[PDB]
Short mmCIF file of C-alpha atoms and ligand atoms in Angstrom, two decimals:
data_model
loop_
_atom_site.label_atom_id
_atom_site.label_comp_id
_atom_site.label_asym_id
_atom_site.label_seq_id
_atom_site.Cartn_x
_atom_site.Cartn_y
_atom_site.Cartn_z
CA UNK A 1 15.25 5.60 -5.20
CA UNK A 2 13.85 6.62 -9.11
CA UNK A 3 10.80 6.36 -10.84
CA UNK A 4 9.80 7.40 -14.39
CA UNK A 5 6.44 7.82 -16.45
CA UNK A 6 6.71 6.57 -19.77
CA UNK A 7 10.61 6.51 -20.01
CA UNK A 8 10.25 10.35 -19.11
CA UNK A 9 12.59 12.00 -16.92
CA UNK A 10 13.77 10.66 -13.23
CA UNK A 11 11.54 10.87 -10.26
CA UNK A 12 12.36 11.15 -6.72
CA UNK A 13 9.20 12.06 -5.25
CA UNK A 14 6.04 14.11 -5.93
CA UNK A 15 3.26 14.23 -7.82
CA UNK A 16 2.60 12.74 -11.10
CA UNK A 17 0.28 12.62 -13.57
CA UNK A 18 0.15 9.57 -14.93
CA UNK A 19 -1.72 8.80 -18.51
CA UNK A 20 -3.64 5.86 -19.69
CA UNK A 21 -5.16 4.58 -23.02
CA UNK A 22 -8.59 2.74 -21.91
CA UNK A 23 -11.05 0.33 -23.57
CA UNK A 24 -13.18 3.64 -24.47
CA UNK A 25 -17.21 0.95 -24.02
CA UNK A 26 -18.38 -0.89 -21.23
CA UNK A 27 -21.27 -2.64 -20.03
CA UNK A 28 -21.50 -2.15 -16.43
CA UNK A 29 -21.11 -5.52 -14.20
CA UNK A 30 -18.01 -5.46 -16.82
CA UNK A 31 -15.06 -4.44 -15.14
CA UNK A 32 -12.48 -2.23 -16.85
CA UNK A 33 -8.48 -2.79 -16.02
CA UNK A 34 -6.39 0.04 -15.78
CA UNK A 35 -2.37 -1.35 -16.28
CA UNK A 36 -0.23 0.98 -14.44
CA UNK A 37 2.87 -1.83 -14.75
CA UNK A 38 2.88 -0.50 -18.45
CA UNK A 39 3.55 3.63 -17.65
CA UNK A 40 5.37 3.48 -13.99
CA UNK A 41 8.84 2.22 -13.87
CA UNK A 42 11.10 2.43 -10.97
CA UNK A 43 14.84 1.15 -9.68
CA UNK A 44 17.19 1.18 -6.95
CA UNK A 45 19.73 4.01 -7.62
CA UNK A 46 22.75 2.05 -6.50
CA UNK A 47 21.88 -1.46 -7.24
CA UNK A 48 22.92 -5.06 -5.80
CA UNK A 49 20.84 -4.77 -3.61
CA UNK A 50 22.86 -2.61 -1.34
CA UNK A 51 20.89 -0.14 -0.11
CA UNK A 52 17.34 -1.69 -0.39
CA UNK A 53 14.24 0.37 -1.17
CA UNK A 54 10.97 -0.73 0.41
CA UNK A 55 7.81 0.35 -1.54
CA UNK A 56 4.38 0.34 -0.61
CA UNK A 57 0.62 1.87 -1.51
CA UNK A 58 -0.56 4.00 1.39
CA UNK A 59 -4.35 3.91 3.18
CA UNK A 60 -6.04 6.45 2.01
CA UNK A 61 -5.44 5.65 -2.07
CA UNK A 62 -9.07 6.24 -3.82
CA UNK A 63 -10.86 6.65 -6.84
CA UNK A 64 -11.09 10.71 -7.95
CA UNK A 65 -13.61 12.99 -9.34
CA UNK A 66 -16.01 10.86 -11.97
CA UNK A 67 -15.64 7.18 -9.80
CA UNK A 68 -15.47 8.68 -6.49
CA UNK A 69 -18.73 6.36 -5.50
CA UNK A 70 -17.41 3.48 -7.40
CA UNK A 71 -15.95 0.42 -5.87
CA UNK A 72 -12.65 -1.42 -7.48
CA UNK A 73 -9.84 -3.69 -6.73
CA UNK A 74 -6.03 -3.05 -6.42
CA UNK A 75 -3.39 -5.86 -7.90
CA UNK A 76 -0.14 -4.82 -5.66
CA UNK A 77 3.19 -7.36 -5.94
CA UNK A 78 1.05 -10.24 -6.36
CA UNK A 79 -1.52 -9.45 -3.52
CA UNK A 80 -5.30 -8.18 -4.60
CA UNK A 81 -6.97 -5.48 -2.04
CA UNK A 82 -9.86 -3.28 -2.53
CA UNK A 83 -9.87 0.13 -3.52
CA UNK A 84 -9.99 2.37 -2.28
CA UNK A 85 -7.63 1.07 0.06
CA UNK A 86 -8.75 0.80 3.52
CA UNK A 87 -4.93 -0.16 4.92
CA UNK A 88 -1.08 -0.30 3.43
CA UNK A 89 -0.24 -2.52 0.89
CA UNK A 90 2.29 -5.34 1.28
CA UNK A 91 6.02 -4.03 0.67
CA UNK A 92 8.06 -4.74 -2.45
CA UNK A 93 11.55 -4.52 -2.04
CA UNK A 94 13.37 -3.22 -5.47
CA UNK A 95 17.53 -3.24 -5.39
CA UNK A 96 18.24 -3.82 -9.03
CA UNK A 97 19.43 -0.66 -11.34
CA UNK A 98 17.52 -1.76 -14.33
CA UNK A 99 14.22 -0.25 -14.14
CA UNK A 100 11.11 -2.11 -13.14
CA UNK A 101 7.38 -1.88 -13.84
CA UNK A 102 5.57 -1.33 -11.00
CA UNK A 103 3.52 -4.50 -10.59
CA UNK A 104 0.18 -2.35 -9.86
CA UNK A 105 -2.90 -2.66 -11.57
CA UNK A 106 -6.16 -1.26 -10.93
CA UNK A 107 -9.36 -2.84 -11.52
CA UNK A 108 -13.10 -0.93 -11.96
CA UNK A 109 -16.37 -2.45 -11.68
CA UNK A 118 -18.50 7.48 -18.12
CA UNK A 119 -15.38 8.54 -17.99
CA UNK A 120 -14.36 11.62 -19.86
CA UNK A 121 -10.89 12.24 -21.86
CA UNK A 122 -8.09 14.29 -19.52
CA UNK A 123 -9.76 13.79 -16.04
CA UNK A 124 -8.42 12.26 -12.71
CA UNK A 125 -9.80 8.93 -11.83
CA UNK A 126 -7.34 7.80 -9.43
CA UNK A 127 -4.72 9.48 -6.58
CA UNK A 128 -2.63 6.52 -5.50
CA UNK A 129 0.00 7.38 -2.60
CA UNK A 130 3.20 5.17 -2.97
CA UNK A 131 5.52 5.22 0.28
CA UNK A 132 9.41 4.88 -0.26
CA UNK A 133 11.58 4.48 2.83
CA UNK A 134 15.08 2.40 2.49
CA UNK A 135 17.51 0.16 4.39
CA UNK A 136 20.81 2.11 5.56
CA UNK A 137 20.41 5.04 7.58
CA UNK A 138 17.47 7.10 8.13
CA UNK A 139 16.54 5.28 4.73
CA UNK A 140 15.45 8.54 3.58
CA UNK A 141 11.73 8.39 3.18
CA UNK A 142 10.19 9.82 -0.24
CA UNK A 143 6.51 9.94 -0.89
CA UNK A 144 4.86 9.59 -4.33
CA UNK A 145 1.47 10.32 -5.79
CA UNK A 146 0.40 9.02 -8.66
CA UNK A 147 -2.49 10.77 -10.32
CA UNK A 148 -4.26 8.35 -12.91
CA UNK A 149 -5.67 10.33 -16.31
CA UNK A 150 -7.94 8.58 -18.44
CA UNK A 151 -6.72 9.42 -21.85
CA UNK A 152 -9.31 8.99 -23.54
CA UNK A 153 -13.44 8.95 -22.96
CA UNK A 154 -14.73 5.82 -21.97
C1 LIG B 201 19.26 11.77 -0.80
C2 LIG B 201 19.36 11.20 -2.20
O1 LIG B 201 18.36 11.06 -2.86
N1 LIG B 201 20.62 10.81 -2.74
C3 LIG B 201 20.72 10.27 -4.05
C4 LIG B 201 20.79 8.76 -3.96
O2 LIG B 201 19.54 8.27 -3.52
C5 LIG B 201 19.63 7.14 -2.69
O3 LIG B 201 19.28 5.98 -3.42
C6 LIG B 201 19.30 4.80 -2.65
C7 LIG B 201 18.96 3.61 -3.52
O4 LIG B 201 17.77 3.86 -4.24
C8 LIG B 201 18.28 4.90 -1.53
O5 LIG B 201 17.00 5.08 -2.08
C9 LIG B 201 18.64 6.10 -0.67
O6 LIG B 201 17.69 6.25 0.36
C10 LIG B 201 18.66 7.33 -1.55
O7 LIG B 201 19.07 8.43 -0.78
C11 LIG B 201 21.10 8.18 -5.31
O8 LIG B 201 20.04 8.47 -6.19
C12 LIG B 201 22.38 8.79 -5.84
C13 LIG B 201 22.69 8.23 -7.21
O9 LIG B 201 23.91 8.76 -7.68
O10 LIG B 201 22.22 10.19 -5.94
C14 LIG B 201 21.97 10.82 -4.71
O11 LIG B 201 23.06 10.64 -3.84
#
């Protein structure tokens, strides 16, 4: 199992920063959406849906540093959850070679350029064998001030 950050290089587990360009002025009550889909990419290594890999977000996935105290919502594979999340996500099962965007958003209801406002734990553990479990954590940079 692979994932990449902005077409970058191959990942197979580990932490990575990943880097986002935000709407840089809110009003608060106005909720600011943070598309993840757009920078994290992943595929099965094999494909046809051979060896399946099952993906999930792991308990324990929170906001970091500035929005610690802020509450927030989690779009995972078509199911919403709060953040930060309280249990595992649902799976999503990726067999295809072609790389695909991780259908993750995250939702926020002062923010400074270059700091981590998210840690999300992603779980990989596949089909045959021991399925050869791989953890990921994605560390969310705001890219700019907001
Ligand atoms: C141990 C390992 O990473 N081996 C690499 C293969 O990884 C396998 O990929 C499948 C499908 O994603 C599944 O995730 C297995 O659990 C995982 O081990 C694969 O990347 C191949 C590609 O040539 O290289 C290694 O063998």
């Amino acid at each position: 199992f692979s994932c990449n950050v902005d077409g970058g290089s191959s990942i197979g587990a580990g932490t990575t920063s990943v880097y986002v360009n935000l709407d840089p002025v809110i009003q608060p009550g106005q909720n600011l959406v943070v598309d993840l889909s757009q920078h994290i990419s992943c595929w099965n290594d094999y494909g046809g849906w051979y060896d399946t890999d099952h993906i999930n977000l792991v308990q324990g996935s929170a906001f970091a540093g500035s929005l610690q105290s802020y509450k927030g919502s989690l779009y995972w594979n078509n199911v919403t959850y709060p953040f930060p999340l309280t249990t595992n996500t649902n799976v999503l099962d990726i067999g295809d070679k072609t790389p695909m965007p991780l259908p993750l958003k995250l939702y926020i209801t002062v923010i400074k350029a270059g700091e981590v406002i998210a840690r999300i734990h992603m779980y990989k553990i596949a089909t045959l064998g021991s399925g050869n479990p791989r953890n990921f954590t994605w560390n969310i940079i705001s890219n700019n001030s907001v």
